[PDB]
Amino acid sequence: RGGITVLTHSELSAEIGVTDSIVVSSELVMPYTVGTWLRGVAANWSKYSWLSVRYTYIPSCPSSTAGSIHMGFQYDMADTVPVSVNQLSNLRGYVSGQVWSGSAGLCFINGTRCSDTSTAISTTLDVSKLGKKWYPYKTSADYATAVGVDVNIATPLVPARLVIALLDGSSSTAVAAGRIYCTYTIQMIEPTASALNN
Amino acid sequence: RGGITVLTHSELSAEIGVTDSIVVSSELVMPYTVGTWLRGVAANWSKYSWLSVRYTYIPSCPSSTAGSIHMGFQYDMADTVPVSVNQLSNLRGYVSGQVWSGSAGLCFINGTRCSDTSTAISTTLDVSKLGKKWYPYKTSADYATAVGVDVNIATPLVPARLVIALLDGSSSTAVAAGRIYCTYTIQMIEPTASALNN
Amino acid sequence: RGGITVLTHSELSAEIGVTDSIVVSSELVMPYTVGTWLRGVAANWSKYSWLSVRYTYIPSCPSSTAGSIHMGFQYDMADTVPVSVNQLSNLRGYVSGQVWSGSAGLCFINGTRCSDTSTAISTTLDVSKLGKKWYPYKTSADYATAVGVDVNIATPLVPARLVIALLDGSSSTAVAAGRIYCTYTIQMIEPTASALNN
Amino acid sequence: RGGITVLTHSELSAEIGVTDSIVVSSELVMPYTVGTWLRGVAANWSKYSWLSVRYTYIPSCPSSTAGSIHMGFQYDMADTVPVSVNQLSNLRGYVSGQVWSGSAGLCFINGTRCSDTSTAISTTLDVSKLGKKWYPYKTSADYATAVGVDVNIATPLVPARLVIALLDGSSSTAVAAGRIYCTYTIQMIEPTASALNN
Amino acid sequence: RGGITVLTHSELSAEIGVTDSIVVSSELVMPYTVGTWLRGVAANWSKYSWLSVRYTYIPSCPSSTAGSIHMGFQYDMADTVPVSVNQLSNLRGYVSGQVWSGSAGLCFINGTRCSDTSTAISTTLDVSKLGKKWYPYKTSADYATAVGVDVNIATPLVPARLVIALLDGSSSTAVAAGRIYCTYTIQMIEPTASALNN
Amino acid sequence: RGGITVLTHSELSAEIGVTDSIVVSSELVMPYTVGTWLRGVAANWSKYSWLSVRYTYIPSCPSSTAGSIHMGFQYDMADTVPVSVNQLSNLRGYVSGQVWSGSAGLCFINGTRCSDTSTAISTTLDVSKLGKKWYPYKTSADYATAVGVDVNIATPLVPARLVIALLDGSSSTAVAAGRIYCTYTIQMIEPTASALNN
Ligand SMILES: [Ca+2]
Ligand SMILES: [Ca+2]
Ligand SMILES: [Ca+2]
Ligand SMILES: [Ca+2]
Ligand SMILES: [Ca+2]
Ligand SMILES: [Ca+2]
């Protein structure tokens, strides 16, 4: 009976800094890597499903801060990570904005009512188009070993990766610009002692 | 047109014995391993889907027989197999009972009408929450080689594993207590010469 | 006009004993062999049809009695009789249970109202799927001579055979465990002097 | 499409004579043996089904003729043929009457409308209760060889046999009393060159 | 409950070659002999019923290939196999055509939608008119032994035989002309360990 | 919003030649391998789904050309490729026909209205029964490396493979017989710079 534990929550996912040259990075879109809170929570369940997953950038810098942020999704971990804004702009859910903009995205995190989100530097995952619905909970280590053998083994383990790019900064030394928060509604099923979850 | 061959049947899946110390084991929940009958039948089809899969324990010992049996499911073969009753109790579909109890589960096997199944030491799979619906028919050998490279390769090959634990026995030497039968309704598709099915 | 004499009744069909090693046996499912009562009654009719035939095991031993009983049906007398519990479990109407269990099956015999039959070690014949509906009344002798020429001659003479297996006992010498009763609703047609019925 | 050729017809089946002592005989109820006409016709078809089969006795002697006739059916050719009027009277469709009576049965042959058939020494087969519906067309020779191996082989080859008994005559030498005609509605299917039909 | 496993499938049944003189042959219409696939599958069940059985000839030769093929059914194995096209033409389901024709019959195999099948050299069994509905699964060996005693023992074991005739070829040495495929919808009941099925 | 780009198109997939001995081959049913056009198009998207995929054989030879073609699908790349027409005939979507036949399949390619397709040597994929709906776009190289580690890694990467067999030819040297075209309706999602798609 039942078996599904649905949870909606937001948490810090990453600290962001800018430099005068492009820096491209990416993170897996799975419970273990979105944040420390969900990592601990979801480990108590064997599998999960994303009903909704969104990454929102919130600025913490002066309006005079130089720089821009870019985000988008990739779904075949075997694919090459973008190396330019041009390539990144082709991805699904691509968003772009000043490193000091994005305040409007706060309402997604708060979960509150909000209309003025045009400037929100926030992107959400197309959960209906993922390889599958239910994925196994995986730890970085186990995952790393798997892709170590062959990247394609990742497909049945993770739905996608968020690609981030930062540039247009005024310093060669990273300047703290903002943070990326992850807001999600996740369904967790088939409980397990967390100690056994790899 | 059509293409689906639906079959409902029960068969012996495992002989059970108890000792005075916990013995944990597990079996894959796939056509090849549930039993000799289905193993032979399903090999004539490329893929299959579990509409229903249940494992029922039927006792064959005196009411004075010491010991208890425990069962539950795991879905990420990379996860560590439980080592204690405590951990096993956390699993989905966990059941527990005296090694001489479980007679009531007979009606599931017989497929007959039955109300008094409260004491039935029988557990059924949550087929709707599996990684996917259609799985490829696999042989132990081929599977073994695959997980040999990396366990995670098992996810797209098998839906789950049944974890069994026996203890509370009165002897250090196994005492025949009962048997575990598997009752299933399986959909088999895309026929193939059995000789080619690995 | 009419011609059908319908009768519903139960009677002793076999005495059961257990040993520490498997003993497989079988009986034909025809009027002459189910029991002494029906044998005498049905001989007064040329043919008959099974509307319902069920074999129920009733225990007569202490709850401390070791052993288990197994039953199932076969329909092609030319087929080899099972030699293991594993094979027997594949048969239609397969039931299994402790040699001291099965009390719940009493209500089928009594014909009374009853809900709690989950533990009943009773199996019923799929009369709708038999080779045919009306079979000739046959005596053991005549039948024996026929299968003596060739087993396949049995197909048009008998609908099926009940296969029984006993094991898990604690003694090499049979221990009286219980009895198998046969409950049936039979239609008898085309009367004949019993003396002429072979 | 279709495939069934239905035919309704009557023809001479046997000449009857009486003596002062019982003479019991029997004939198979199949196309080949009911009469010369149907024997030739039905041989052009592989199988057939009796929709209706009736044997009617028509007298041809003076009202002063001593003797009586008796008829009935048997369905298991392995059964012993009756040896007395007493036994014959137990059979399905048993009829009895004076060797000079039975004129009323003429209307069944003629197929005409008729109410006064109380005295008709005519019996009809319970076609709905036969072993099966479709029987193979068989020749006496082939049949004889089959029952030669074992009588029971006849069950799937013929539906029944008509048992006739004559006695109460006034002479030890047979006196022509009448004739037995067979009226039938037969469905013939799956045509074949008659030369190949055994 | 239930007990019926319905399956619809097509498979190679026979390779066909032509010569300049008639060659008549026949095959039993039972699971074991229609093809290697069904032979293996159906052995896991005690009995079966043909809901539909059709034999389709598919050419594989040039349009210049001389020769014609003929097919039809027989139902009494005791009957003599036809020796001429004339006799074969009398059988139920008789079809005839050029050895290079029959391409249109492909849609029956594919199971696809199709209107233009006038030229299809395909014949289907009149399953409703067979001796019975449920037949026992038999192996060639067991069957051979049975008919060895007497052919008529085959009636309750097999429903019919497909008679094939090839002639009008241009060579005394067989020329590969095409293949005969069998498309069927079969109901299999009363499972059994395949090893016990004779 | 949206995200799905649906496309229906046909293109050359393979050139076909026949010899006097069987030659079995197979191709993966994925965008990269069906043809050069789709290979280039689909590379601009991360994943895709087959709404419909059909392979049609179109002849280009004289009616006097000897030889036949056979096609079917397999879904577990770990399975052994058929080695005989007999084995191939067991596969889902199996079609067979003269190497000079199949003209009728042209309408599937043209997409036009058409009723007379009985002779069309065309087979379509059971897209609803694939392991999953959305697959990642893969290049031959990346795929080759993956199956190089272990074949089973292919399951989450490709839905099936088309198995082709050619024989009955009149020459040991391949004779151009026809071509296989692929007609598909594909949904492409999650765009990406083609250069990054592996
Ligand atoms: Ca895990
Ligand atoms: Ca396989
Ligand atoms: Ca009898
Ligand atoms: Ca015949
Ligand atoms: Ca058999
Ligand atoms: Ca890719």
From TrEMBL, chains A, B, C, D, E, F:
Keyword presence, Calcium: yes
- Gene Ontology CC entries for this record: T=3 icosahedral viral capsid
Domain of life, source organism = Viruses
Domain Icosahedral viral capsid protein S: from-to ranges: 1-193
Query: Which sites bind Ca(2+)?
Result: D76, D79, Y137, N197, N198
**Where, per UniProt, does this protein localize?**
Virion
| Keyword tags | Calcium, Capsid protein, Metal-binding, T=3 icosahedral capsid protein, Virion
The reply on keyword Metal-binding is yes
Family in the record:
Belongs to the icosahedral plant coat protein family.
Name the UniProt record assigns to this protein = Capsid protein
Tell me the lineage of the source organism.
Answer: Viruses, Riboviria, Orthornavirae, Pisuviricota, Pisoniviricetes
